[PDB]
Design a protein around this ligand. Sequence first.
Ligand SMILES: Nc1ncnc2c1ncn2[C@@H]1O[C@H](COP(=O)(O)OP(=O)(O)OP(=O)(O)O)[C@@H](O)[C@H]1O
Ligand SMILES: Nc1ncnc2c1ncn2[C@@H]1O[C@H](COP(=O)(O)OP(=O)(O)OP(=O)(O)O)[C@@H](O)[C@H]1O
Ligand SMILES: Nc1ncnc2c1ncn2[C@@H]1O[C@H](COP(=O)(O)OP(=O)(O)OP(=O)(O)O)[C@@H](O)[C@H]1O
Ligand SMILES: Nc1ncnc2c1ncn2[C@@H]1O[C@H](COP(=O)(O)OP(=O)(O)OP(=O)(O)O)[C@@H](O)[C@H]1O
Lengths: 138, 449
Amino acid sequence: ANEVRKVKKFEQGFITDPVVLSPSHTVGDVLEAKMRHGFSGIPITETGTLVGIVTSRDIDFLLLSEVMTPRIELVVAPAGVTLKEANEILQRSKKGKLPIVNDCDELVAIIARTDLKKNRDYPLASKDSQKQLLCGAA
Amino acid sequence: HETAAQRYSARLLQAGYMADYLISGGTGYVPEDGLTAQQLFASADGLTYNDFLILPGFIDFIADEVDLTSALTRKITLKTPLISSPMDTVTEADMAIAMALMGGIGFIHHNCTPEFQANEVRKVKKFEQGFITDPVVLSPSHTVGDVLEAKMRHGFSGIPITETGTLVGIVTSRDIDFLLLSEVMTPRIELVVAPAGVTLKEANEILQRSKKGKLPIVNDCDELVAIIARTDLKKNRDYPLASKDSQKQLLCGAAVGTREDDKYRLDLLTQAGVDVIVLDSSQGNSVYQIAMVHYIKQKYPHLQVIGGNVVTAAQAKNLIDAGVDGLRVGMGCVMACGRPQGTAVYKVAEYARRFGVPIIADGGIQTVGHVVKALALGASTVMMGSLLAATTEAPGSIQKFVPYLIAGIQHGCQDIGARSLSVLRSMMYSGELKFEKRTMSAQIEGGVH
Ligand SMILES: Nc1ncnc2c1ncn2[C@@H]1O[C@H](COP(=O)(O)OP(=O)(O)OP(=O)(O)O)[C@@H](O)[C@H]1O
Ligand SMILES: Nc1ncnc2c1ncn2[C@@H]1O[C@H](COP(=O)(O)OP(=O)(O)OP(=O)(O)O)[C@@H](O)[C@H]1O
Ligand SMILES: Nc1ncnc2c1ncn2[C@@H]1O[C@H](COP(=O)(O)OP(=O)(O)OP(=O)(O)O)[C@@H](O)[C@H]1O
Ligand SMILES: Nc1ncnc2c1ncn2[C@@H]1O[C@H](COP(=O)(O)OP(=O)(O)OP(=O)(O)O)[C@@H](O)[C@H]1O
């Protein structure tokens, strides 16, 4: 059921199933996640999908808990956007993450700049009537 | 300097229990067992490092108090008794920096155009630890494609920019990832540049606030002088074994040939500021090497000169009294001349020592045991050969690898019971250190084969 959920929710540019950490978290248990999942730019709010980001450059000189980015991030997707619009925002912003936030002013999805370097046109879409990927189960 | 009998009797009296100090001094008797070095080489069998052992002594210090300070030449001194050999397969500007940061020295090889060797010396003298040596600066007139490919040429991609060469801005992959333009990238606005030359620990604090990947170093003229990269600040180590000159920058040497065409090579290297010259030659005692020696000492009276290879006291005499300040003691390690290396090192070291001209035991060293030996026989420094080839510095990393040899030498000179290589040699020449020969049956059983 988890795998199928993961597959139905793909969204092309956005990160499927992003990791949010809790502002009540000393950085060592974030810094090791780079040793667990490999990625290391983590968005930060109470438990799930507010303050900004904790990112490798914030930690690479160091213990502390939340002496990193408050709610003060650069330009972001204000509700939900086309991938082509976020591609232009990343160009001006130069930063590596781009949050998407809802009208309640909380994170709802996130983008990574490295994936925007490599996303493609897929005319052979294989999408359902709800415009998201088809998948099967044995 | 105190003998095993002096140290045992004194250190026993530090713990506590007469006419035993008054009837034989601090020499409270020890058995004679094994050969002094002068006896070992008396038989006129030509020994090499596999043929003898050093009978263990009395230990009264930890394996981390074995001072390794050695002397390279009459005036250059090193924190480590190692050297990288002047070979194309071993030493270039990268390994020369790596050796000096490990307290040794490196000699840049000479199998090249004279200009290339002078450039590789210049690259070593100007190291500065945290800063990027020889940064790449691009012109505001270039189209971005000829910057974006440099990432395909040199691999890095945060290029500082100004009129032709060492600031008006920067360009980085983040300025270029989405696209060809000619100039649209970050103009002068930079988040806390260094206004002049600064301490590396100050730049370490500036990068923490600034969060950017590059930190320009500028001058009161409002132009670049150097640049720092964040990735190097994450990793730069302590190097207390400094190997620095009086001007507080790295020592390095250069090999030169002895040909008539080499006064020009020697000029370019002395203009690049090289600290020491090794006269590369298969046999050093030649009229045109003694001419080359007299020529250097007549023209550049500051430059230290290490005499090309010898294996006899007669060769060592002719080069010393020509004025050289060192000696590569090694030859023939199929050619009809040469000497067994262990006998060469002992005989040349024992001769040179009369004048104070330390030697350099180059040739056929392939274990840390052989290093400890070559240092017990009289060599002041050991020149690591192809042992360093197939490391990542060779044209598994020299910075990580040299500490192994250091700890090995220290453990050795601890079992021998000598607290510092200078004491090891003093203990050898005074006949306090005892040696043993080894039949083939005694080394076919105990290692080696
Ligand atoms: N916050 C995140 N939550 C979950 N996965 C993420 C997250 N950030 C990065 N990833 C994973 O890594 C990929 C993007 O890598 P990215 O360039 O963002 O790494 P990074 O955070 O910059 O890593 P690093 O700091 O080590 O360079 C995504 O496709 C996804 O697989
Ligand atoms: N959208 C954003 N707006 C503002 N600041 C951000 C944003 N995303 C990340 N940051 C912060 O900016 C700095 C740089 O992070 P960024 O994602 O741009 O690169 P990075 O993950 O450090 O990349 P890299 O590790 O490869 O050098 C960090 O302090 C980070 O917390
Ligand atoms: N401007 C430069 N000129 C010359 N060498 C440089 C320069 N910038 C970086 N380097 C080289 O690149 C190495 C790594 O630097 P850095 O991590 O900052 O690369 P970068 O500019 O961020 O490259 P990239 O954007 O591809 O990751 C440095 O140790 C140095 O050897
Ligand atoms: N010292 C600086 N002061 C201000 N801006 C700078 C400075 N150095 C670089 N920049 C700019 O800041 C942005 C990010 O540069 P940065 O050095 O962090 O990227 P980078 O590390 O080279 O790229 P990457 O994250 O892929 O490794 C770019 O627009 C760059 O031109």
